[PDB]
Amino acid sequence: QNATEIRASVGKMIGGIGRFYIQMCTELKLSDYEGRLIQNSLTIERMVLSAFDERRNKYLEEHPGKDPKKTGGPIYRRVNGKWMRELILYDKEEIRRIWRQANNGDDATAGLTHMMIWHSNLNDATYQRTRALVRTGMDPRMCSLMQGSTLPRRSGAAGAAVKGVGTMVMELVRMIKRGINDRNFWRGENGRKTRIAYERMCNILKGKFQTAAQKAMMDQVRESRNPGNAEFEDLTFLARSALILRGSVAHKSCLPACVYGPAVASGYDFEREGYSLVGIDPFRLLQNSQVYSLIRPNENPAHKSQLVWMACHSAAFEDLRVLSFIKGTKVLPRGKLSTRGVQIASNENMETMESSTLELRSRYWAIRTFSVQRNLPFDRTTIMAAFNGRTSDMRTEIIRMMESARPEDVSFQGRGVFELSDEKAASPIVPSFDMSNEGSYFFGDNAEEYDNH
Ligand SMILES: COC[C@@]1(C)COC[C@@H](COc2ccc(-c3cc(C(N)=O)c(=O)[nH]c3C(F)(F)F)cc2)O1
Numbered sequence: 001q002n003a004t005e006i007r008a009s010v011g012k013m014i015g016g017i018g019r020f021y022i023q024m025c026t027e028l029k030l031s032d033y034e035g036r037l038i039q040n041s042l043t044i045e046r047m048v049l050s051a052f053d054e055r056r057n058k059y060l061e062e063h064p065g066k067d068p069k070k071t072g073g074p075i076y077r078r079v080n081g082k083w084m085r086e087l088i089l090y091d092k093e094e095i096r097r098i099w100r101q102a103n104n105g106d107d108a109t110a111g112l113t114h115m116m117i118w119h120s121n122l123n124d125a126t127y128q129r130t131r132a133l134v135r136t137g138m139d140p141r142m143c144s145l146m147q148g149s150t151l152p153r154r155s156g157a158a159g160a161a162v163k164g165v166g167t168m169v170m171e172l173v174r175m176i177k178r179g180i181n182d183r184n185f186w187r188g189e190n191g192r193k194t195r196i197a198y199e200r201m202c203n204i205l206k207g208k209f210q211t212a213a214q215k216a217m218m219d220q221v222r223e224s225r226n227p228g229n230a231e232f233e234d235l236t237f238l239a240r241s242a243l244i245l246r247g248s249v250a251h252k253s254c255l256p257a258c259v260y261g262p263a264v265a266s267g268y269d270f271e272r273e274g275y276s277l278v279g280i281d282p283f284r285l286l287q288n289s290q291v292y293s294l295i296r297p298n299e300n301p302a303h304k305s306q307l308v309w310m311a312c313h314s315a316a317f318e319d320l321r322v323l324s325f326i327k328g329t330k331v332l333p334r335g336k337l338s339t340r341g342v343q344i345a346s347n348e349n350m351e352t353m354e355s356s357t358l359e360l361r362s363r364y365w366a367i368r369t370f371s372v373q374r375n376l377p378f379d380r381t382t383i384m385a386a387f388n389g390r391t392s393d394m395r396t397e398i399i400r401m402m403e404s405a406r407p408e409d410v411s412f413q414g415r416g417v418f419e420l421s422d423e424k425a426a427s428p429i430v431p432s433f434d435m436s437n438e439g440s441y442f443f444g445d446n447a448e449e450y451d452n453h
Contacts (some may be wrong), residue, residue: 007274013110014275018264020048020102020111021257027098028088034077038293038308038358039344041258043073043088045115051095052112058154059116061452071095074344076294083294083353085344113158116151118254120162122311123150125334126341127450128442133166136173137232141385142166142239143442147249147317150450160204161250164317165242168205169235172198176227176235186226198227205238208247213397214238220394237395243386244378244402251314251368253282259289259312280423283365286312287420291358294344303337305359312360316441319376319410321433326417328363330437335444345453364429365420369413374431376410379440 024044025035034040049059050071065071072089103111129149130140145166151159175198178185185194199222206218217238221231254277263285264270275281295304310316310331315323323331344353386402416428438444 004274007276008271010277011270011273011275013108013114014260015264015270016099016103016106016108017111017114017257018260018262018268018270020099021261022265023098023102025261028075030075031078033292033355034075035261036258036290036292037076037355038256038258038291038342039074039076041256041291042119042343043075045119045257046073047071047090048095048099049112049116049119051092051099052109053152056154057152058156059112059152060119061152063452069093074346076344076350078355083350083355085350110158113155114254115257116155117148117158117162117252118256118311120148120151120159121252121254121314121316122308122342123450124148124314125307125311125316125441126447128334128445128447129450130445131449133170136170136177138166138170138173138236138239139385139388141381142169142243143445144317144382144440145169145239145242145249147251162252162314163204164249165205165208165247166239168201168208169239172201172205172221173232173235175201176231179227180229180232198222208249209238209242210248211245211398211401213394213401214241214245217392217394217398233390237389237398240386240388241398241402243382244405245398249317251317253277253313255282255285255312256291258291259285262289278368279425280365280418280420282313283362283420284423286360286362289360291360292355293342293358294353295356296340296348297352297354298338299340300338301356302359303332303339304342304356306331306337307339308342308358309360309362310441318441319439320441321376321435321437321439322412322431324437325431325433326362326364326366333438333441333443333445335446340448362420364417366417367414367425371415372430374412374433375408376412376433376439377435378406378410379438379443381440381443 021044030040046060050062053059069092070089071092072087074085075088077084077086100107124147129146130143133140133142145164147164147167148159148162149167149170151163175194185191202218202222206215209215209218217234221234224231293304293308295301309327320331320333412431417431418425418428
């Protein structure tokens with residue numbers, strides 16, 4: 001009976017985001033089109049994360065905003081066939097009241113982390129993190145292990161699950177660099193809290209490893225009373241190892257509020273029907289949805305649609321050849337998309353801006369991981385980065401595992417793909433892949449580096 005109870009409590013969370021978005025569209029007097037504008041969804045999603053964040057950086061990152069009791073951003077309206085941008089300012093107390101009213105009195109912080117994860121996934125598909133890796137002394141080819149790297153600093157347990165091996169390594173390495181340059185970083189009251197933060201991140205990263213030797217190496221890193229070069233080296237060693245010996249990184253398909261809003265509006269009872277982020281529910285919901293996006297004059301709308309599709313399905317870090325078989329169209333690496341980002345900057349010219357319908361559908365659905373061996377080669381930059389390296393018996397054990405798994409390539413995991421009509425997953429399809437296609441989203445990447453406006 002517990003399986004249906006998880007579905008009901010997740011559905012209850014979804015339904016509250018839906019009712020909240022409907023009430024917000026209503027307050028703002030947004031049309032059906034404006035309500036389904038993904039830029040409007042972002043502003044409303046951020047408004048409620050900002051109303052509960054209270055400048056702690058738990059659900060959001062904002063530039064310091066003007067009046068602490070007020071929050072807002074850009075709402076876009078179609079006046080006389082043209083898109084206009086307006087800066088709204090809503091009372092944080094009032095936003096919190098609408099959020100709680102939408103969730104039948106409950107605080108529903110799971111609804112907030114759900115929207116925060118959606119933002120993180122959209123950032124993982126939009127902006128590059130290569131210069132950030134270089135600044136921490138890390139190999140920029142660790143770009144494929146950067147799940148949830150734009151998450152806000154105080155994102156708790158809900159953020160930890162979706163973070164990658166490289167994200168945890170980058171975070172822990174930044175602390176070790178501060179301790180190396182300044183011993184006072186591990187002293188006093190600040191040092192006591194940083195030590196507990198360090199031990200927490202170590203156990204979160206350790207939990208992500210799936211071998212005995214990698215977890216045992218994380219114990220050595222964690223027990224180190226004064227972290228220095230030897231801890232940085234082990235962490236980067238384990239990050240290189242995570243390119244072949246894949247870790248346990250939770251990938252959550254979190255949709256925008258302008259997807260949950262219309263489904264709730266049409267009477268879908270998410271609490272009663274149940275909802276699961278794993279499987280058909282997000283794919284089925286995107287088939288029954290209609291979302292729009294503001295687009296720039298030189299952007300391809302099929303490319304803007306792919307970026308949003310990848311963000312919806314938390315697919316930025318998946319093998320492109322796998323995503324192409326599931327979507328039914330060829331999914332291109334970020335360096336081949338002629339699009340620059342969903343969010344409209346304050347300095348952009350709205351007079352040239354147009355709108356387009358986002359293609360968020362998929363040929364097949366699939367589930368998060370007598371069979372036929374269906375292999376996919378490791379990408380060229382993955383093998384060079386993973387085999388870039390002082391000595392230990394756990395290091396030789398990890399090297400032995402990395403060298404024996406390497407010729408085996410990446411086998412597709414799970415029992416095939418499913419037609420959208422097959423809701424019970426009883427008729428799997430053979431997944432074919434054109435092994436000549438790149439396979440990594442970040443190959444030849446030219447996307448803007450992540451920055452807070
Ligand atoms: C480096 O990849 C490692 C391998 C080769 C290991 O074997 C598994 C294989 C790929 O498997 C899948 C990856 C992603 C999905 C999937 C699932 C959901 C979901 N709600 O459940 C979703 O929302 N979206 C997707 C999508 F494809 F779009 F990313 C299904 C299967 O990847």
